[PDB]
Amino acid sequence: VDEIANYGNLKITKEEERVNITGDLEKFSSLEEGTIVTRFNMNDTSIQSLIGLSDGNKANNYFSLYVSGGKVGYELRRQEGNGDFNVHHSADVTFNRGINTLALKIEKGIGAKIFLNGSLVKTVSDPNIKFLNAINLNSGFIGKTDRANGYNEYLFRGNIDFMNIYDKPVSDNYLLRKTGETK
Numbered sequence: 001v002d003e004i005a006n007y008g009n010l011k012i013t014k015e016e017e018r019v020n021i022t023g024d025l026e027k028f029s030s031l032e033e034g035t036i037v038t039r040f041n042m043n044d045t046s047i048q049s050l051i052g053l054s055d056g057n058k059a060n061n062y063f064s065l066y067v068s069g070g071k072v073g074y075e076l077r078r079q080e081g082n083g084d085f086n087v088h089h090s091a092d093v094t095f096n097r098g099i100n101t102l103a104l105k106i107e108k109g110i111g112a113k114i115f116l117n118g119s120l121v122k123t124v125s126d127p128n129i130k131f132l133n134a135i136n137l138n139s140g141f142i143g144k145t146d147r148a149n150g151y152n153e154y155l156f157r158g159n160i161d162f163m164n165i166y167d168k169p170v171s172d173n174y175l176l177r178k179t180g181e182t183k
């Protein structure tokens with residue numbers, strides 16, 4: 001494989017560390033499809049954004065790939081007051097106590113798949129699936145979704161071993177094998 005963006009070896013134990021990838025948005029802003037593969041260790045059980053790409057200074061205008069105590073999912077929201085929507089695809093899963101590996105796969109005209117620890121944990125069949133191209137972005141973060149001020153930013157605590165972003169779907173086979181390294 002070959003990523004358009006590669007982040008790794010990150011420790012996020014408090015609010016301020018906390019990885020600002022805003023300066024990289026031009027790489028992701030036009031993606032209608034793609035894949036995110038990330039290896040991580042969570043410390044809390046609340047909804048935590050592993051990666052949040054968001055507008056503003058807005059409340060509900062964001063992409064969020066999140067993990068929970070018992071869930072994995074993503075949101076793509078808008079906001080703006082014209083063509084507004086709230087997408088939410090998630091799955092009940094059981095994580096390793098320690099290190100976990102997930103992948104979100106988006107394929108334009110097909111839909112979405114979520115992988116975790118070498119299993120396909122969710123299939124979304126949607127020929128009209130949307131991705132980053134569908135919202136305006138002015139903020140990017142690994143470890144939270146940047147939101148207005150009174151809205152929950154899904155603060156992550158723990159470590160991120162790696163975070164690879166691709167501009168193409170990427171085979172199920174590869175994704176099963178990479179995430180499967182933490183089966």
Ligand SMILES: CC(=O)N[C@H]1[C@H]([C@H](O)[C@H](O)CO)O[C@@](O)(C(=O)O)C[C@@H]1O
Pocket residue numbers: 047066075088151152
């Ligand atoms: C992944 C998920 O379910 N997100 C939802 C969150 C969480 O349930 C709470 O923030 C948990 O405290 O709640 C909302 O009201 C919000 O904050 O915008 C709606 C949003 O879709």
Ligand SMILES: [Ca+2]
Pocket residue numbers: 041042043097098099
């Ligand atoms: Ca853990």
Ligand SMILES: [Ca+2]
Pocket residue numbers: 146147148149
């Ligand atoms: Ca903020």
